[PDB]
């Protein structure tokens, strides 16, 4: 039923065929199926690539024909007339199946080439309908790429029997596996979204496709936030990846040394940090953990960060700001009284305990200094050391034995934090030697047993001191060109919010200075 | 007229005499003056120190007698009876004048021993009055110490003539140089305040008397404020001296990078800094300039700071935080448009000039980097260099010549900042070679010609790099034990409020650590 106009175009279009096409028909003696025999044999006669065969004992509609390459039995199936408005749908099916490429976004085409679900699409059309080809062609494309996605386009003029049995007022009308899909306009892009609803949001593929960063900051505590703002203000492409925006301050409650702010709160300062950040062009990535730094193999090239989610980001410059974790005792009641008397930092919370009795857990330098600190502010201090002797510098140990409101207890293992449901009221411990249990009444417990920088993921790539801290010069420079670090994760002598924010800003200005110096062409 | 009780005490009290006393009388034949002859000769007869002479041609009241040491004619003069309630006033005058000491605050006594004004005090009393001795004795004491302060105590029973001529309803009643002074109760302490109303508030003597500080912080910008809060929170004795509380931020207007605070203002942040400070025990000294550090000559001893006012303060530890001054062009209109388009820092203000044309003044590193910075943010940048070539690292000069929105002008001396009464609209300059005048239209002028740390007052005492910055390690330690430094005055690579506050806190924690380590007895 091809008109001469269609023939000439079709002859011209089949000249753009690089693979051999076969049309496999299933026909039933009716004059409609005779009309489709004629057509297939007309088309076959127009090209040496195109062969018309027929197999009339297949479990598919009659009349219909599979378009395919030799051997393989995968491709678009038309039932009834592939003419009218669907003429250009038919040329396209032959072309694609014969090696011509899709004229649309190849990213989607790969996405489609990899899909797991088994889908038969059967679209219902009729020859008169103007808006039906775009849906037909769409789902045609799909059937060629992935062999799991089958597609039968159905002319309503030939199957009024199926039009009624299954209600179809209005075409086009598609039916994914004997189930209503959708009607009217649908672009391929739009089709593929809905089909992969039970998709799997590969946000790691989102991340892998991003452009290189001018600076990528790893860690979104105070240090990294501060660095993100200073970087964004220079207008450079800036990224800020971290596990949890706000770092340590988020789990903090009463904060009284953020300079200029007599009293604030962790959740609030963290929100204030997020607001300042969003005042600038900063791609904030949350809930994402860095697992490896790969240093650029040449100056002027790019460093890489690997995430635990399997993504890889790329940056002209990196800033590490991943902080530290204070070690816990891991005893009953420790959790329960976190921020209600059990604390870590003596700098931050010391003043809250004037007049009160406290304990320091840990006999290292950090614990011993902490006790000499608290001793001046508070009424009584009890230091408890797990080992049979204190580890701290002698100078400090003698100074602590000099004060009149302090007790040292050796071989003392804290077993329980006690409180009243609201606040700490005491401590239980055992003598690791005789096994004897003991009780202290107090209002505060300062755990000073070790800081652990979050840097074991950097082993081998940047240099660390012997406590795990990232070694930095005054400019926050690491031993790798174009990698800087700021905050508690580094060798800064002290760990405070106000100190960490200053270092992030430094690291940012140092990173910018390195970008502008990276030479020329 | 001495009764036997008075004699016995007086005999006992004159035994406490270390110098020779002379009573010089002026007497007029009346039986009152005969009554004072008798008395003087009774007293003379009670001690070998006390001699009674009389000179009856002196320009003073009759009867009266000067009490004094031989030769010299200075001391308390009584007119009429020095008896009744004023008996014990008389013993005291003889004792003090004969070398016995004042039983009251010797600080005041030195203050009084040094006074410049010429004062005759004449107090009016009468024998019956209970509250008159304390005023009489007070002003007696004064007359012995300083020889400029004369004092005649006047018995009203003998001079009813002067009681009426000069109205005196109610005693005691004192008259500094023929002029009403005061009536009723007056302590010496209270007398001396009022007499030195035209005193001179030696606030430097206030400062010289203060106890040693645990830490003395020099400079009350952000760095020193931050250090004062961290120090005070440890409860140590802390002092914060500076020229002007708030440092550089006070003259600053729009501040958009104080981390956590999207927009604040200089005068406000400075007030917020003052409030946080006053939340703790910090002796704030304002309007006071340090002129010299004298390092302790031994560990465990005290450093000293000399002020321009001549005061000297003492501290176990010092923190220097005296900042820097950006160099000005010193041209007409520079002042006028300070904070209205003329600025110093490109980090702070760069973002305000998106789309705008700007100039950078200065072809050093700081200027050239600044131009490469602004070039990315802004539409056009014009760098003007006073010399015939730029000074900056070559790397940077080539990078600046690489950009497409930049002009370099050599031998260019800015002559005028132009505006519209509100904001900068352009710049005038001369070619230092041909002398030709030129004009540029712009909205911003970034002056980048040199930072000058405020540290020339430290020459020789602590070590400085070659740009004048105080050399510090990561711990803010200087090359002198127990002296630390923080903020723009030091070698920190960048000068920002958030960076300076972090350094002040560091320097504080480092200073505290040094205090606790300073050994033992
Ligand atoms: C209970 C408590 C109370 C405190 N109170 C005060 C106080 O009153 N005042 C004060 O000044 N300081 C206080 N501090 C300390 C203060 O919070 C720290 O100085 C500050 O948070 C350090 O900031 P930071 O940016 O360097 O690191 P962090 O705050 O620890 O933030 C680093 C961030 O990076 C994340 N991260 C870690 N590893 C990775 C990775 N591989 N990839 C991506 N992200 C990663 C971390 O989970 C965190 O979110 C307190 C700390 C605690 C624990
Ligand atoms: C116009 C302008 C705008 C700025 N805008 C910003 C901005 O938007 N953001 C930002 O982060 N930074 C900004 N800055 C810079 C910021 O103010 C500095 O980083 C910061 O003030 C440095 O603090 P500081 O404590 O180290 O020293 P300073 O702020 O300079 O304070 C030191 C103090 O010590 C005093 N002093 C000096 N000598 C002595 C002495 N011998 N004895 C006693 N006291 C002494 C000084 O007069 C001053 O009061 C700006 C600076 C200027 C000039
Ligand atoms: N300046 C800082 O803020 C900072 C912070 C952390 C570490 N550091 C430095 O790192 C080094 C490590 O010193 P440190 O004191 O942090 O660690 P440390 O390992 O040297 O001392 C830890 C001590 O805790 C004791 N201990 C452990 N578990 C205990 C428990 N459950 N109960 C009681 N006692 C227990 C151990 O016996 C040991 O004495 C030092 O050089 C220190 O100066 C510095
Ligand atoms: N990182 C920082 O924030 C910081 C701040 C200040 C200085 N520095 C360092 O100190 C050194 C000094 O560099 P710098 O650039 O501050 O100073 P510089 O003296 O090296 O350069 C100053 C330049 O200004 C030019 N100049 C002076 N007056 C001028 C005028 N009125 N008009 C036009 N041009 C004029 C001079 O010709 C000279 O080229 C460098 O090593 C720099 O890195 C660093």
From Swiss-Prot, chains A, B:
CDD domains: AhpF_NTD_C, AhpF_NTD_N. FAD binds at residues 214-229, 478-488. GO terms for molecular function: alkyl hydroperoxide reductase activity; FAD binding; NAD binding; NADH-dependent peroxiredoxin activity; thioredoxin-disulfide reductase (NADPH) activity. Keywords: Acetylation, Disulfide bond, FAD, Flavoprotein, NAD, NADP, Oxidoreductase, Redox-active center. Disulfide bonds join 345-348. One of its GO terms (cellular component) is cytosol. The modification N6-acetyllysine is found at residues 53, 354. Its EC number is 1.8.1.-. Binds 1 FAD per subunit. Belongs to the class-II pyridine nucleotide-disulfide oxidoreductase family. This is Alkyl hydroperoxide reductase subunit F. It comes from Escherichia coli (strain K12). The gene is ahpF.
